[PDB]
Amino acid sequence: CTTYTIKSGDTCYAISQARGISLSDFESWNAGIDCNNLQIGQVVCVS
């Protein structure tokens, strides 16, 4: 997994859009992530 660290204002949609990936694919790589409750410093997979 390529990792990314959540920063202020980030959203799962915007991370996905920036990388040209679907939000559903992103979710499939992120084990039930709570996209409405992201924490600054949280680490996600972007591939």
Q: Which residues participate in the annotated binding site for Zn(2+)? A: 25, 27, 34, 36
Cα atoms in the Cβ-side hemisphere of radius 13 Å centred on 46: 17
Could you tell me if 38 and 11 are in contact, meaning their C-beta atoms sit under 8 angstroms apart?
yes
* Minimal distance, residue 7 CB to Zn ion, in Å: 19
* Minimal distance, residue 44 CB to Zn ion, in Å: 14
Residues 8-47 that bind Zn ion (CB under 5 A): 22, 25, 27, 34, 36-37
- Residue 46 φ then ψ, to 5°: -115, 15
What does the binding site for Zn ion look like in residue numbers (CB under 5 A)?
A: 22, 25, 27, 34, 36-37
